[model samples]
Target: GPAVGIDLGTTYSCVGVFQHGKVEIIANDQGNRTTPSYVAFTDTERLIGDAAKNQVAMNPTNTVFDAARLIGRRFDDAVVQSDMKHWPFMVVNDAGRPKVQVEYKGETKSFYPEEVSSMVLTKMKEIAEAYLGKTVTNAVVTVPAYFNDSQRQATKDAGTIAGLNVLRIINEPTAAAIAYGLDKKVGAERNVLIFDLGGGTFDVSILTIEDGIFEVKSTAGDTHLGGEDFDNRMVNHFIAEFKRKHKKDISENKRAVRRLRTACERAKRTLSSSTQASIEIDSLYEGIDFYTSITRARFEELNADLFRGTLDPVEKALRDAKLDKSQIHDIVLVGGSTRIPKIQKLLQDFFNGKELNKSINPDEAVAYGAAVQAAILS
Candidate 1:
């Protein structure tokens, strides 16, 4: 049986298996490599990944995404409270610990955040099992470097609930660095900086590698910032523009907001390769078709602060590591959101023309590294 690796991310999850002298990402039943980090409780059954995401608007409260934010936090945590305000589902305070209250199988079930995360892990495990035709019991999971002891423990607990042996819990950035380091020669000394900006979070870590040892000097990130925040900026801009152009407010309409947000997300991805992106929706709100075109520079302007905010973590990581920008031999890019031209440009600009190491796929690097660890541990 092959040892598996899991990247349990905030918005999406990925699984990788190291076999036959290499690590490969496993695709889900839907033929997609990455699965949505969502668990939807329907009246008759449960759904994970794409099925869970497709009905988010219609089954808003029953669909729980972003469980990573609350996996080990208390109900009183400021971040949890602020995030809950925007969440459609109800997060109950069950004696201080946050619980997801959802209706499943004609019963109101209150699940621990770890349980929600486990559902995702279970799905990933199933995907790997199907691909390998063997029961999986050992895994190396990844989480953010800044995650505290409780968060890491809770993540392990989630894997336990998912029936994994949980051999190790690896830091997301270090996992990426390991993936990058494995591809290079072992005897070289390189000060590597990993810039990981995913759909829901951003992280910066500085590490020095000599003779295959990855010494993570420092790590810093904002859990609340990432690609979704960029999407939100565009979503809000479209919402207000709609209100002004049609003189009607669609913010209160949850379905409308979700639809527009989905379109905005697509447009944002489109802006990555083009100078302009068009968001067109048929009968988006109250039977009104919505169409708008936004230039890449305009999109950059909208997220100027957020894009600039990414630099702070890098600076903090450098200061903590006691290193200079020019001293960084290579800057590794992680997370699919790092594909944004503005983000990549900012990173290069900050590093004083250092070419980014796109050697590994951003979306799969963490899990890929974890898979390598799994093979080693096993």
Candidate 2:
């Protein structure tokens, strides 16, 4: 069995298989970039990858799998339940665990997050097996640094159910730092700070390395904060505008809310590079006009508090490590959220003009480092 690396991200998942002294990303059957960490089941058939995401528009009721947050969580968790409210399907407490029931073919199928995650893992393994003509039994998987022992164990269990030999559960930020260090050849004798703001979590870790020995000095995070929060901010803004225009609350409509959430995500991504983005919600307030073009600056302004949410953990990491703001040798940015200029600016300002290193590609770095870890474990 060949060794592989898996980034089991909350929003997306990618598999990196080792070959020729390096790790390579295996393309799915669709020849797509990365397999979505989403699953959709209709009637008796299950759909994964891009197909699952595509079906969200038509069959949002049947799709499941953003199990990233739901994994190892209690159904009574207020924050999780709050997020679940926006999801297409209802999440219920099935014997103390967060479970979702999907109505299909005149019946209902209930699934836990672990089960959904297992499906994703199985699909990734299938891709690797297909590409390399070998079984991918051994793998190094990455998780959010903030995940507790129970969550880590659940992830390992998911691997087990997928028929994988998970060697170790590497933290996303740690793995990303390893990839960055390998790229820079900063193998030893350096202090690295990793700031990870992924789709569902925000993490900051201070690490020390000497002679290929990497030690995580301290780690802190807010699992509830990430790209999703930003999208919610946008959604709220849109809803407010819709109410002002038509004197009706669009937030009360589930389908309209879902459509706005999807639009909000697109606008958030666009604001990363564009100066302005216009969002139009059709049938908003029963066809009454409610559209807006927000500047990048305005978006940042609206999200200023959300941007600052990660700083608390960053400060906590530094305090726990007994390292001052000026003591950091380098800062490594990870996760897609780091692409936001406002985030970069805030980081630089907090560090007092210290340059934040973007040496690692946010999306690919974690998997590559995970691949290295898989190799080392083998």
Candidate 3:
């Protein structure tokens, strides 16, 4: 009975399996390896992944997209309060914790973040089972290294609700370390730093690897800082530009905002590899079209502060680890956000020009390593 490795992320989730002595990330029925981590309560059925995300613009009030961000936090937690402002769905106080309220089957339902996350975990599990063509019960899940005890426990509970026997809870950066086989180098010890900035969260960890043993020296991060921030920055820039040129503020238009958000996300992805990209929304509001372009330099300028902020965790992690910068032998970038050229440049400069190790897939490494661990546990 082989188990699966799951990266249950804030904005997206991934499942990986070790098959035939190699790791392969499992794709959902939609043929997407990294499924959008979302759950939507519709009139007829509950939906997860691509189906859930596709209908979000029209059903934002019933779709839950950022369950990972709210998990294990109080309703009034600064992080929770701040994130709720951007979320389209409603969050109500459930005693001290936050609960998502949605309309399903002609009734109102309120769900704890753990339960909502469990749906996504279940979806991932189903994908794995389908790919393997067998019933898969055991799993290894990875989370942020900086997650507190409460957060870790909540994740475990989510897995339990998913009907999974969670064999182990592994730190995300540690999973990447394993993915890269940092400990397999013969007669060598490596000090590695993992900078993971994903769709909804950022994490940094310093680790020492020797003789197949890994010691996570220290960890730090901004839970709410990630690719989403960069996308929002672009969205704002476009809105401001449109207002100045077209004399209309479409910010209050839900349909316009949603379309703009989608365009901005694509633009940001383009900027990662191209020096030029733009956002164009047809009939965004009042049947008025809007278009604006940005150079890589402009995009970099827009998010320069955020790029710098990514280094804050690295600095703090180094301090907590009591290690000098020169002691680090490898720098690994994990997460889709790490693909941004400006971020890569900023991080490389911070490391005094050390080449980042990016041979591993940024989005799938955690699950890839976790899948390997699942086999080890089996």
Candidate 4:
């Protein structure tokens, strides 16, 4: 069997199958482009992706498992606790460790973050197994470029729990850059930067290549900021509109709030293609109806601050490398979210006459790069 390449991302997880010198993105059993990375168990049925996501939105109280952001932090850690405030999971302290509670067959069970992630990894493993027609053992897993030792070790532990050998833990941005090099057939003596903005993490990486050597020079990102943050901006917009129209604090209603969040996510994706959409809250707050039309421009305005959030890191990476934009050979955009026209415009304006490269599929580049690495290792 060919070794697999796993993204193992916080908000979403994807596994790529490599065979016969080709890398392929494996669709989940549900035929989703990407796995939900969220798991939910209830009595006799287990669900993920659109199914679990729907349950969490409609009835978040029973279905649990939003283990992505909570993966490597303790319950007492202020960062984790503060972040937990928005999460739907009933996170509770279990002897100082962060534990997620899920309902299964009328019984509630507590699980560690690693265990939840292992379940996700195992699902991805099954996808690989089905695609490659054999059991997959060795693989390359990608992480945020800025992950520290603890986070990286935790990822390895997740792999262990899934019963797979993690041949290497590669950083997301660098992996994209590697894929860029392979795709463009860039000779080994050039400098390039990888801009990785995914659903849950933003990473800017500066790398140098010389004579078959790829070395990362500098990196910066925000684990807390991503497309999900952008989606929250829309959610907050609805919250304000809701309060003004309904004469009530809709934010305090947990079920309604989760539905709002789900709507926000759907709106975010829909607004990408449609000019206008509405928030639906049927029979909410004494038969009150809420709706809004959001144009793409409105979305850009509402989330401008988030767009600004990425620039500092880009400039900082350039400063750390001690090179002006004109000195770098290329700026490659990697990540599904980077397909946004706004981000591309921002990169063009910020780089001072430098153009962005998008010839490679942002969603699949990292996995292909991981497959490239797997090829080298074998």
Ranking by lDDT: 1, 3, 2, 4
Best-performing candidate as measured by lDDT: 1
| lDDT digits (tens) for residues 1-378 of candidate 1 | 478989999999999998987889999998999999999998898999989998898899899998999988889999999999988899999999999999999899999999999999999999999999999999999998878999999999999999999999988887887776543566777788889999988888888878767677898888778889999999899988999999999999999999988898889889989999998999998899998899999999999999988999999999999998988887889998898999889989998878988867788999999999899899
Ten contiguous residues minimizing lDDT sum, candidate 2: 180-189
List residue ranges in candidate 4 displaced over 4 A.
59-78, 90-97, 182-188, 242-249, 273-292
Best by TM-score: 1
The per-residue C-alpha lDDT of model 4 at residue 338 equals 83
Judged by lDDT against the true structure, how good is candidate 3? 0.89
Residue 5 of model 1, lDDT score: 89
Greater-lDDT candidate between 1 and 2: 1
Better of 3 and 4 by lDDT: 3
- Lowest-lDDT window of 10 residues in candidate 4? 180-189
Candidate 4, pairs of clashing residues: 43-105
Segments of candidate 3 deviating more than 4 angstroms:
74-78, 81-86, 95-97, 185-189
Candidate 1 weakest ten by summed lDDT: 180-189
Candidate 2 lDDT tens digits, 1-378 = 568899988887888866777778778899864677888888767888777876776687888857988888888888687888778786888888988788866688888888889999999889889998977899988887768998898899899899999999988877887776532444446778988887877888888777777678998888778887898888888788777766789777766777888888788879888988888766655766557777898889789998976788899999999999887888988877988889999999999999877855576678878887788788
Let me know the TM-score candidate 4 reaches against the reference structure. 0.86
Candidate 1: list runs displaced more than 4 Å. 76-78, 182-189
What are the lDDT scores of the predictions, listed in order?
0.90, 0.81, 0.89, 0.76
- Candidate 2: C-alpha RMSD to true structure equals 3.4
Candidate 1 residue pairs in clash (backbone atoms < 3 Å)? none
Decreasing TM-score order of the candidates: 1, 3, 4, 2
